[PDB]
């Protein structure tokens, strides 16, 4: 169910569409449910389409939430081992419950580990996922040292995060130094700022949120995430932030000066989402 509570991309604003109402079934429209799931799948696929998971063994989600992402990957590719890190003992035990109910206990794990300073289970992951996690970590240099040192050579880091133009948002120059100092080479950056803003736009958001608080009930962690998502959409509309998808690879053999060059190209000139079609 938590998989319905993530970002998505809409090419234009849809009057009557409210990601909050649709995800919770308050909107009974089957076609709007299709739109919600499609827009969330389209955003995830920008990152996931780069990886041939038949040639991958281990995945690390270093801020997994309720582990919706790694559970879906585990059910889609039944050979994958997926590890998630979370700071919340609540989320950690609720995630393993969801994992138990789906018979995924042999492959999918959720650990209460601080990804900024705590090493994961595997020495080298083939894929590392970070969807809106680094923005909530201020010790980003310690974090990217931990991520890169546990990424296989040539392995993929797949980030969805914010660029500045309680979150700790950083500038394009700071992203370039983060990746370059730890041997991470961008294959592509994709800017989805406007399309995510369209997805997040709910002009009845305040009314819709209060309805969920009193008519279905909401935990404090959930209400804080929903209000954060709304404020993120406003920052995107105001162009204070960009939402960018990073596809990077661990590369220890490229010269450091060239690494900074090619990371700067992608960070300062990401591909616009509306111009891409991969098939």
Ligand X SMILES: Nc1ncnc2c1ncn2[C@@H]1O[C@H](CSCC[C@H](N)C(=O)O)[C@@H](O)[C@H]1O
Report how far apart, in Å, the C-alpha atoms of 263 and of each of 29, 31, 189 are: 43, 40, 9
Nearer to a second copy, 107 or 185 (CB): 185
Q: Is the dihedral of CA 39, 40, 41, 43 positive or negative?
A: positive
Of residues 7 through 36, those in contact with ligand X by CB under 6 A are none
Q: Helices 220-237 and 193-200 meet at what angle, rounded to 10?
A: 130
* Residue 270 beta carbon to a second copy: minimum distance, rounded to whole angstroms: 12
Stretch that binds ligand X, among 84-92, 186-194, 197-205, 264-272 (CB under 6 A): 84-92
Q: Which does 49 bind (CB under 5 to 8 A by kind): ligand X, a second copy, none?
A: a second copy
Nearer to ligand X, 34 or 136 (CB): 136
Q: Give me the residue label for tokens 């997805």.
A: 199
Would you state the structure tokens that stand for residue 4, as one six-digit string?
């319905």
* Residue 79 beta carbon to a second copy: minimum distance, rounded to whole angstroms: 14
Q: Helices 205-215 and 220-237 meet at what angle, rounded to 10?
A: 170
Residue 261 binds to ligand X (criterion: CB under 6 A): no
Q: Which does 272 bind (CB under 5 to 8 A by kind): ligand X, a second copy, none?
A: none
* Residue 90 beta carbon to ligand X: minimum distance, rounded to whole angstroms: 9
Report how far apart, in Å, the C-alpha atoms of 56 and of each of 33, 64, 124, 166, 277 are: 31, 19, 11, 34, 24
Q: Give me the residue label for tokens 């585990």.
A: 74
Tell whether 65 is in a known binding site.
yes
Q: Helices 256-268 and 172-181 meet at what angle, rounded to 10?
A: 150
Nearer to a second copy, 65 or 155 (CB): 155
Quick note: the x/- pattern for ligand X over 111-140, rule CB under 6 A, is ---xxx--------------xxx--xx---
Footprint on this chain of ligand X (rule: CB under 6 A): 4-6, 62-65, 68-69, 85-88, 91, 114-116, 131-133, 136-137
Residue ranges for the binding site for S-adenosyl-L-homocysteine?
Answer: 5, 44, 65, 86-87, 114-115
């Amino acid at each position: 169910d938590e998989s319905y509570l993530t970002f998505g991309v809409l090419n234009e604003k849809q009057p009557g569409f409210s990601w909050l109402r649709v995800a919770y079934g308050l909107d009974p429209s089957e076609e709007r449910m299709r739109l919600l799931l499609h827009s969330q799948r389209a955003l995830r696929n920008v990152l996931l389409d780069s990886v041939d998971f038949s040639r991958a063994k281990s995945v690390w989600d270093f801020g997994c939430g309720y582990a919706s992402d790694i559970i879906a990957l585990g059910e889609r590719h039944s050979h994958l081992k997926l590890h998630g890190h979370t700071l919340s003992s609540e989320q950690a035990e609720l995630g393993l419950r969801k994992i138990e109910a789906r018979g995924l206990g042999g492959r999918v794990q959720v650990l209460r580990r601080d990804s900024s300073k705590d090493a994961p289970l595997e020495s080298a992951y083939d894929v590392i996922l970070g969807f809106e996690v680094a923005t909530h970590i201020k010790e980003k240099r310690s974090l990217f040292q931990n991520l890169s040192s546990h990424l296989r050579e040539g392995g993929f880091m797949l980030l969805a995060d914010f660029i500045a133009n309680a979150s700790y948002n950083v500038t394009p120059s700071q992203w370039v130094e983060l990746l370059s100092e730890h041997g991470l080479r961008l294959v592509e950056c994709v800017d989805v700022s406007q399309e995510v803003a369209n997805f997040l736009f709910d002009a009845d958001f305040d009314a819709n949120l209060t309805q969920l608080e009193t008519s279905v009930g909401i935990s404090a962690i959930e209400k804080r995430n929903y209000q954060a998502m709304r404020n993120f959409g406003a920052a995107l509309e105001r162009k204070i932030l960009s939402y960018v998808l990073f596809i990077a690879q661990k590369d220890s053999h490229v010269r450091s000066t060239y690494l900074r060059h090619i990371n700067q190209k992608w960070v300062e000139a990401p591909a616009p989402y509306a111009a891409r079609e991969l098939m």
